[PDB]
Amino acid sequence: RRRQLIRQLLERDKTPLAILFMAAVVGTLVGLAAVAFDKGVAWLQNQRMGALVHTADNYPLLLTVAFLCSAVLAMFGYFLVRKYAPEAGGSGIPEIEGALEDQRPVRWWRVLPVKFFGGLGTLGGGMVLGRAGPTVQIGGNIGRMVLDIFRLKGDEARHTLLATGAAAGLAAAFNAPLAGILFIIEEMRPQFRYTLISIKAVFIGVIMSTIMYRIFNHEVALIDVGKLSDAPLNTLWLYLILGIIFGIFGPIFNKWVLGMQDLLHRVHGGNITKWVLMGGAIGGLCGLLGFVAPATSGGGFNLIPIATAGNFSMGMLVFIFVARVITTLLCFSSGAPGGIFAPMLALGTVLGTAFGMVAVELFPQYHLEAGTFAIAGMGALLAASIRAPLTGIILVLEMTDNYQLILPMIITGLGATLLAQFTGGKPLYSAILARTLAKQEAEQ
Amino acid sequence: RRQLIRQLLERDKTPLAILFMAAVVGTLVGLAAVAFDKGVAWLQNQRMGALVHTADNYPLLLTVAFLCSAVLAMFGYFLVRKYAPEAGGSGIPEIEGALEDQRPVRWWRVLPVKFFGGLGTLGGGMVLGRAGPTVQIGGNIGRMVLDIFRLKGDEARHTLLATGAAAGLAAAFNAPLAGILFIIEEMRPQFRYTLISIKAVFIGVIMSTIMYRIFNHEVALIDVGKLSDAPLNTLWLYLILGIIFGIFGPIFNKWVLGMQDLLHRVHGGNITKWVLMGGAIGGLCGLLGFVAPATSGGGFNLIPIATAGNFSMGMLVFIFVARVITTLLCFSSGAPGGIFAPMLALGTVLGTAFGMVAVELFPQYHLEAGTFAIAGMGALLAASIRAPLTGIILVLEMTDNYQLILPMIITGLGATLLAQFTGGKPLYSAILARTLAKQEA
Amino acid sequence: DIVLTQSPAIMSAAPGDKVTMTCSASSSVSYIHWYQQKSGTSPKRWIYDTSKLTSGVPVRFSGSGSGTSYSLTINTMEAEDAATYYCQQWSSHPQTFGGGTKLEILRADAAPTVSIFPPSSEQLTSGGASVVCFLNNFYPKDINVKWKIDGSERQNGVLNSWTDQDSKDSTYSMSSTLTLTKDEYERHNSYTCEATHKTSTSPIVKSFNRA
Amino acid sequence: DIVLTQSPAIMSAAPGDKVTMTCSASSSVSYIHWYQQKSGTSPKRWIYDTSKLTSGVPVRFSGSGSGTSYSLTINTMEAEDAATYYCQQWSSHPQTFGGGTKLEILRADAAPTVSIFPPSSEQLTSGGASVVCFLNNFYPKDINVKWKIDGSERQNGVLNSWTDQDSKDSTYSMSSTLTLTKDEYERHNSYTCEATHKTSTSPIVKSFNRA
Amino acid sequence: VRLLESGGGLVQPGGSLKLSCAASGFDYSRYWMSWVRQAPGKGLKWIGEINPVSSTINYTPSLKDKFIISRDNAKDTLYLQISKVRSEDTALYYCARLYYGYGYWYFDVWGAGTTVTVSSAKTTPPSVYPLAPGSAAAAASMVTLGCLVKGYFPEPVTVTWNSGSLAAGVHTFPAVLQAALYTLSSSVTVPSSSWPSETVTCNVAHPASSTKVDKKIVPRA
Amino acid sequence: VRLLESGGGLVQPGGSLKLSCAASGFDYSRYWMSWVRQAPGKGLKWIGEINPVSSTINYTPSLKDKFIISRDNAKDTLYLQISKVRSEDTALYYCARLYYGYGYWYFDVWGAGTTVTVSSAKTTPPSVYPLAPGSAAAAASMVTLGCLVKGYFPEPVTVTWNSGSLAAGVHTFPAVLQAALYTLSSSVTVPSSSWPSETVTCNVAHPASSTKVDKKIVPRA
């Protein structure tokens, strides 16, 4: 068989020029779109504000206009999904993860509009959902869409354009090219069998996707925490322990995200109305909290920098943590079109900080600075739950730019994935495509 | 399908034992990775303490230089040829191939021969990196623990062996991320699913890295401070630099292989005429390492110096040409030493050169050569060895200028592209091919 | 070194008016900028990269163009947008600035508020005789002043300076100042200033006397 | 908070000689440090984390220990190791410090080079009248002066100050100044100074006469 | 975030002067500094830049060492050395902090500026005389004070009232040359209920002569 | 990396002085700074430490505002505010940069130090007196000199011979405080060939009283 290898080696990394020029166009597109979704969600969350500022004086009128303005968006959200593509609901990656293994479909003619405008309304309303997966999925579909258009054959031009697309997606969502490429080659890919995916294409994809972003959002970052302090060697063990904490909690959260999916399902029994209704219900509760207590609502970013700086009293943190687990569980387990990736970055950040503070003074000799453990634990949930430490770390890194902390970030992240496996956790994203890919049969 | 649901729900469950091993392996590849680093130092140093001791007399100096070097080189090639002709060359291909069960992992042999061998080939100061040399000491250390505690399965095998190669490249550049990425992008079986435990590889790298840090904290390998940023209307200049590397990447790939043939004659496999031509080149290194330091040695020393723009354009061109040659000589001559690092040094020099031309051909971009240096520092690792993703994440960890990440990719990928588009090949695979093919024909 | 040339070196417009000005290059420049220099204040980056407003720059603004001809627009100009606009490019080298465009506002009439001041004691103790006369916040700018030392229309020793249109209100100002040999003043006893401006047929006049 | 107790309070050794001193912890400690403090000079960090030599510390230097007892050691102690070492910890907050250990040089038994001076005129011209008697260079440090104003031992008015081991000859020194008054002085002629040391089986007198 | 330049003043034809530009409000290092000038009545003309480390100092098509830009990140100060001065080299010297959008650079934040007068004239501090009303209390609610500044060189002088605290309703007129010296005055409408019930000082400044003349407006006896 | 500290002095018991540390040679941020103090020939004690973002300050166990440590990362200076100054506070205050290897922090680089003298005694200039051989001496090849500095307060004075050039064979004695007043002497030995040959001048100094005196030793009558 080695008589085969020698042949392959000498042939390695020769991807069809055409598959390439396409990863490039796909990228450019997933980019332009990735931006438009970003800009849109903004415009909305803003109007909603421009409307509270316009009812300033009257309070319960305010709280009402808040709730409704939100609820109305949420409804228009769930709806579009349920009435035109029940897949756009949930994160948005599993249906791509599975679409990679040819175990799910890529109906772009549908899911494009429904995931965009859908989430563009679910997020625009300000629910605890990220543009995370939502952009990934808009991604893949855009790839398949160009695939079909210029009609390209082969499993290579299929898996490729579809996988580069998902990546170019996660890239423009966090302006983190490396983390995108790494998400594919670590999570998205077929996690149980060699695949014909062109990594050189994926790159060109991410590259274009990222240029586009940069072209529209330069002069500012998503997260900015400035160069935090360094992390002494006799300090690393505290990151193993924080890594442990996430590892045990990672699975638990994984249950709640699935369970709540069942439980909440009753409350509408698949009925488009009682659903879209319970939709506007949660949606509204978001507008309301997004005002009465902003931390508990919205994506999560806003408060990231604020928590890393140590501006939230310990207590305040605990509240925000608990209040978030809940609101994130609600919005996501309730099949609303929106990611849970970002909200997890926000969750870890808060837990990490908390840990920080306890350490920051339980060991005055270490000269600790909570903010480090925040950066450490910011992709820790993305580790213990979704189980892709390598992508978590390289994501955090690109966003928080504190490479000095890289060692503690890993010892935490890995320390997590470890305790997670050691306690039965599972790739939250796979634990979804399972249930899904199952029920399709189960429904037989 | 129905199988899938089963697999998914079972994902990422690597045998606790395979893990606790990746951890010990790592600790070991670490301790060793360091000792090799410390050793090569001690030597390059004595050699100096000996020139300082013959200060006055010049041709006596130049001689003591050449010989002290040549003697090490000889003791180098020898050990290899007389006890493990595989320690010669980089050291990765025999691990790359060892991963596909197309080559062997004789650790009881290659450990001492690669260590002390290179610890003498590098200690003498030849244009060779501790790059692959450490990777290979790595893998072998994994297989060694594998055998010792005797673990079965293809997973317990491929894993400890692959984590080991990674923990290796990690302690060689103190770059954990780049190590993990080297495996999952270059080392791992390129054309067929494999049973490699990435969670293990990590634990491996982690331990390997702690060890390093425990012995080399308070200083970096490369330090270039926060360079300037890179404007969008500036990115195209990185595509063009990426093109330049892409065309040259294959060419260099030929020379590294060809020179391997050519130089082979000059000893015809004969342990003596080889070990002799060995001390020949080795000596030429001590000599140049003194008369013109840039042209010799690993390459690091001059990296920072070239990024700062301290070498006149001309001076760069010289150092480039002089380096292609000396790197080709030492590596194509089957001496036990990597060519990974020497390529980092090469790109850095080419990138800078490009820089300077740009730095003034476009006074309106407010350029700063040093950026293109960081950009092109892992550009050869891209156009030649073809692993842009590991190159980039390596440079990043070493030069810590994430701001430049976009230009670094547009260059790197821009290279791999022009390289493929011109027939280049994974220099490391283009070796295991030759190896594997000849080995039978 | 490109040479940028701006549309009207000076132009006038009534607020609410949509106002556009041009900046052209001898060669082809791209992504240019515009600075706003209000009177007696350093320029301020107003628009950059062809058409991007700096931060805090009224949306009523909006630059444009491409290649050799470019423009700055004020869909519905305002009284506060009165300044001189310099475009600049750095897509070539060295960078180059436009000659500017002075935007002037046209508004309702406004009569002067004349004032007269006695050649201060302190200035006297030195031999100077300064009869100051301030005629503020007026418009149009066209105005004529008259000096009278005891009924007689004096001419020499008289100097007057106009401030530039005001940033907020759009009115101009002036100060006529006649200076004598000290005793040149302390010899006659009555001073008058006669301002004559459109807003009135019959001159406004201020006066004071040595006593 | 831990109490570092440096074992030898003082000690002496000759150039080319192995020396060891200690640091006893009131509780557990880890990776202590040692600082060298050269008489009249700001503390220099030597060993750190129980052993590591700081970039410059002479190689003859090392030392270490652990658990609850560390130590400093010099293999062949040269001259340039004249000073005091303070073992500090910070493994447990708040960081504390040892009372230090004084590394004094052991050398040849030099005898006191006594020099007595008569009250400067100036001083005497303002009631002042002190009589400085120097006892420069000697070993060990056990020197004892004494004043006699005409065969009469005089202990009041006396002031003694000893210097630190001489960084160039490792010998000591001490100056006793005897202060009186003009009136009190102008009424006594013999003013002797007597040094009593090891080096001499009997008094190293010295004296002047007001005559 | 502010650039405050100084130095530039009066230099006789052919001689040379140094200009500074104290920076404050930002990381002066990391930023490329630049210079620009406005030769009276004419347009803006770039004079050269300088990168953070000083490893680059491009200039405008000038002369040998006409200009000599240089920084001192330690002091957070930019410099400019003009030598062999001539009438063409007489204007307001702006100090700027450079930046970019997509990539095409611009002058992000300009300082106030400094005026360099090339001329064999002489430095004369300004003379300030209060200008209160001529006892004609027929004063409407509002009443215009305003002091006069005459006999100074070179330009410019700066005038404020009550330290600019009294900002609204103030007019300072452009100076005019006086066959050797410059002159100008300022006026200040105000509520009669505020004067003389409160102080009224015109604060005159002449950077050239490093002179400061604060004249409290005295209602004539 | 150099650490300069100022502010040490004489204070009334009860008073309250402020010491400063001027840091030259390193990115002042990223660092921690702390004050350690050493009483008059006694052990070193840790006053306190303060990080970069000035968000963490710790002090050895002592009454609330017994100490106020602060840092201006805009002048790279470290300050120490001591209140209700007692007698214990009479010590030598050192500032140092904190750094480590493993994570068991050490006082990296120290600084010269500044003395805080806490007393109700009043500042007093020194009377410098010349110590020259006399009436019954016997000029042996080597000759011993020196001058006396009595009656001063506080510390310190600084004696040097021939303005420094004669820094060998010189013996300066630590001052003794008798009856709330200091006195010190310093002898120097030189070849009884170069004196009275050359001029052996002793340069005493007391910043306190602004007293500079270079007493020139000369042969007794």
mmCIF file of N, CA and C in Angstrom, chain F residues 97-150:
data_model
loop_
_atom_site.group_PDB
_atom_site.id
_atom_site.type_symbol
_atom_site.label_atom_id
_atom_site.label_comp_id
_atom_site.label_asym_id
_atom_site.label_seq_id
_atom_site.Cartn_x
_atom_site.Cartn_y
_atom_site.Cartn_z
ATOM 1 N N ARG F 97 11.603 47.962 43.144
ATOM 2 C CA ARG F 97 10.725 47.428 42.108
ATOM 3 C C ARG F 97 10.588 45.886 42.544
ATOM 4 N N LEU F 98 9.354 45.393 42.506
ATOM 5 C CA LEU F 98 9.082 43.986 42.777
ATOM 6 C C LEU F 98 9.089 43.166 41.492
ATOM 7 N N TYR F 99 9.757 42.017 41.540
ATOM 8 C CA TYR F 99 9.722 41.059 40.444
ATOM 9 C C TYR F 99 10.148 39.675 40.921
ATOM 10 N N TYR F 100 9.797 38.659 40.142
ATOM 11 C CA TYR F 100 10.077 37.273 40.497
ATOM 12 C C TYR F 100 10.525 36.324 39.437
ATOM 13 N N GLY F 101 10.781 35.076 39.825
ATOM 14 C CA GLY F 101 11.193 34.023 38.905
ATOM 15 C C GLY F 101 10.012 33.067 38.887
ATOM 16 N N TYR F 102 9.839 32.339 39.992
ATOM 17 C CA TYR F 102 8.751 31.370 40.123
ATOM 18 C C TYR F 102 7.414 31.967 40.538
ATOM 19 N N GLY F 103 7.443 32.899 41.483
ATOM 20 C CA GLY F 103 6.213 33.502 41.952
ATOM 21 C C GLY F 103 6.259 33.726 43.452
ATOM 22 N N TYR F 104 7.478 33.815 43.978
ATOM 23 C CA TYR F 104 7.695 34.062 45.395
ATOM 24 C C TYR F 104 8.458 35.377 45.484
ATOM 25 N N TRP F 105 7.800 36.408 44.961
ATOM 26 C CA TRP F 105 8.294 37.773 44.851
ATOM 27 C C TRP F 105 9.436 38.227 45.743
ATOM 28 N N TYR F 106 10.356 38.973 45.133
ATOM 29 C CA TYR F 106 11.521 39.502 45.819
ATOM 30 C C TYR F 106 11.647 40.962 45.489
ATOM 31 N N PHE F 107 12.411 41.669 46.297
ATOM 32 C CA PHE F 107 12.605 43.072 46.062
ATOM 33 C C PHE F 107 13.733 43.196 45.073
ATOM 34 N N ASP F 108 13.345 43.123 43.809
ATOM 35 C CA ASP F 108 14.223 43.191 42.646
ATOM 36 C C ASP F 108 15.390 44.177 42.708
ATOM 37 N N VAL F 109 15.098 45.435 42.409
ATOM 38 C CA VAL F 109 16.100 46.500 42.422
ATOM 39 C C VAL F 109 15.731 47.514 43.501
ATOM 40 N N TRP F 110 16.646 47.800 44.418
ATOM 41 C CA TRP F 110 16.362 48.774 45.460
ATOM 42 C C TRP F 110 16.734 50.179 45.005
ATOM 43 N N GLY F 111 16.863 51.106 45.937
ATOM 44 C CA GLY F 111 17.185 52.467 45.555
ATOM 45 C C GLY F 111 18.104 53.010 46.610
ATOM 46 N N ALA F 112 18.697 54.169 46.381
ATOM 47 C CA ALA F 112 19.631 54.713 47.359
ATOM 48 C C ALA F 112 19.047 54.797 48.758
ATOM 49 N N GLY F 113 17.885 55.452 48.863
ATOM 50 C CA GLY F 113 17.208 55.630 50.137
ATOM 51 C C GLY F 113 17.243 57.078 50.595
ATOM 52 N N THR F 114 16.289 57.473 51.447
ATOM 53 C CA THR F 114 16.215 58.833 51.999
ATOM 54 C C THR F 114 15.936 58.697 53.480
ATOM 55 N N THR F 115 16.612 59.493 54.301
ATOM 56 C CA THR F 115 16.425 59.430 55.756
ATOM 57 C C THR F 115 15.306 60.316 56.305
ATOM 58 N N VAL F 116 14.506 59.749 57.202
ATOM 59 C CA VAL F 116 13.445 60.491 57.845
ATOM 60 C C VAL F 116 13.891 60.603 59.290
ATOM 61 N N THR F 117 14.174 61.829 59.728
ATOM 62 C CA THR F 117 14.579 62.069 61.109
ATOM 63 C C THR F 117 13.406 62.691 61.818
ATOM 64 N N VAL F 118 12.892 62.008 62.825
ATOM 65 C CA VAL F 118 11.747 62.513 63.554
ATOM 66 C C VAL F 118 12.140 63.072 64.906
ATOM 67 N N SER F 119 12.187 64.394 64.983
ATOM 68 C CA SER F 119 12.564 65.058 66.215
ATOM 69 C C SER F 119 11.988 66.461 66.325
ATOM 70 N N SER F 120 11.915 66.917 67.565
ATOM 71 C CA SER F 120 11.405 68.226 67.928
ATOM 72 C C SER F 120 12.571 69.215 67.972
ATOM 73 N N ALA F 121 13.765 68.677 67.742
ATOM 74 C CA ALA F 121 14.997 69.448 67.738
ATOM 75 C C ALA F 121 14.997 70.287 66.490
ATOM 76 N N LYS F 122 15.664 71.434 66.570
ATOM 77 C CA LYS F 122 15.703 72.383 65.466
ATOM 78 C C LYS F 122 16.968 72.215 64.630
ATOM 79 N N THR F 123 16.834 72.450 63.330
ATOM 80 C CA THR F 123 17.956 72.393 62.405
ATOM 81 C C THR F 123 19.098 73.299 62.866
ATOM 82 N N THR F 124 20.324 72.791 62.808
ATOM 83 C CA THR F 124 21.477 73.578 63.233
ATOM 84 C C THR F 124 22.766 73.312 62.449
ATOM 85 N N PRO F 125 23.334 74.366 61.835
ATOM 86 C CA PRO F 125 24.555 74.283 61.045
ATOM 87 C C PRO F 125 25.716 73.755 61.873
ATOM 88 N N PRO F 126 26.676 73.075 61.218
ATOM 89 C CA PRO F 126 27.845 72.505 61.885
ATOM 90 C C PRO F 126 29.032 73.448 61.984
ATOM 91 N N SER F 127 29.766 73.307 63.076
ATOM 92 C CA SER F 127 30.951 74.093 63.300
ATOM 93 C C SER F 127 32.043 73.132 62.894
ATOM 94 N N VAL F 128 32.735 73.466 61.809
ATOM 95 C CA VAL F 128 33.809 72.633 61.299
ATOM 96 C C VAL F 128 35.139 73.097 61.882
ATOM 97 N N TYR F 129 35.838 72.184 62.539
ATOM 98 C CA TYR F 129 37.128 72.513 63.116
ATOM 99 C C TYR F 129 38.247 71.661 62.514
ATOM 100 N N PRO F 130 39.403 72.278 62.256
ATOM 101 C CA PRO F 130 40.563 71.610 61.675
ATOM 102 C C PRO F 130 41.377 70.799 62.679
ATOM 103 N N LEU F 131 41.720 69.570 62.314
ATOM 104 C CA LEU F 131 42.533 68.737 63.195
ATOM 105 C C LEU F 131 43.928 68.618 62.568
ATOM 106 N N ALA F 132 44.894 69.352 63.121
ATOM 107 C CA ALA F 132 46.269 69.364 62.601
ATOM 108 C C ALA F 132 47.304 68.979 63.664
ATOM 109 N N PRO F 133 48.424 68.338 63.257
ATOM 110 C CA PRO F 133 49.442 67.954 64.257
ATOM 111 C C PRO F 133 49.942 69.156 65.099
ATOM 112 N N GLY F 134 50.200 68.923 66.392
ATOM 113 C CA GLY F 134 50.641 70.004 67.266
ATOM 114 C C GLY F 134 51.917 69.949 68.117
ATOM 115 N N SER F 135 51.942 70.869 69.098
ATOM 116 C CA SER F 135 53.026 71.124 70.083
ATOM 117 C C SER F 135 54.063 70.009 70.430
ATOM 118 N N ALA F 136 53.613 68.759 70.561
ATOM 119 C CA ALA F 136 54.552 67.686 70.908
ATOM 120 C C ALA F 136 54.617 66.531 69.890
ATOM 121 N N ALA F 137 54.027 66.740 68.703
ATOM 122 C CA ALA F 137 54.007 65.737 67.622
ATOM 123 C C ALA F 137 55.420 65.301 67.151
ATOM 124 N N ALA F 138 55.474 64.362 66.206
ATOM 125 C CA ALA F 138 56.760 63.867 65.689
ATOM 126 C C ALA F 138 56.619 63.332 64.246
ATOM 127 N N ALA F 139 56.536 64.276 63.298
ATOM 128 C CA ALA F 139 56.351 63.998 61.865
ATOM 129 C C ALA F 139 57.030 62.748 61.305
ATOM 130 N N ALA F 140 56.354 61.605 61.458
ATOM 131 C CA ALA F 140 56.837 60.320 60.941
ATOM 132 C C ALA F 140 56.396 60.270 59.456
ATOM 133 N N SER F 141 57.225 59.663 58.605
ATOM 134 C CA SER F 141 56.960 59.546 57.162
ATOM 135 C C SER F 141 55.491 59.699 56.717
ATOM 136 N N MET F 142 54.584 58.976 57.382
ATOM 137 C CA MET F 142 53.143 59.045 57.103
ATOM 138 C C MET F 142 52.491 60.000 58.102
ATOM 139 N N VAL F 143 51.633 60.883 57.608
ATOM 140 C CA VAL F 143 50.995 61.836 58.500
ATOM 141 C C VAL F 143 49.458 61.786 58.537
ATOM 142 N N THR F 144 48.932 61.822 59.760
ATOM 143 C CA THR F 144 47.494 61.771 60.006
ATOM 144 C C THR F 144 46.886 63.162 60.258
ATOM 145 N N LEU F 145 45.799 63.441 59.542
ATOM 146 C CA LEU F 145 45.091 64.717 59.639
ATOM 147 C C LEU F 145 43.631 64.594 60.100
ATOM 148 N N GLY F 146 42.742 65.227 59.350
ATOM 149 C CA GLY F 146 41.352 65.190 59.724
ATOM 150 C C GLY F 146 40.842 66.522 60.260
ATOM 151 N N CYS F 147 39.524 66.662 60.196
ATOM 152 C CA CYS F 147 38.850 67.845 60.689
ATOM 153 C C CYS F 147 37.612 67.380 61.506
ATOM 154 N N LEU F 148 37.155 68.245 62.416
ATOM 155 C CA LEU F 148 36.011 67.981 63.299
ATOM 156 C C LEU F 148 34.748 68.733 62.885
ATOM 157 N N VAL F 149 33.619 68.028 62.858
ATOM 158 C CA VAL F 149 32.318 68.620 62.505
ATOM 159 C C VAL F 149 31.328 68.388 63.658
ATOM 160 N N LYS F 150 31.302 69.320 64.608
ATOM 161 C CA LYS F 150 30.431 69.211 65.771
ATOM 162 C C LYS F 150 29.371 70.305 65.835
#
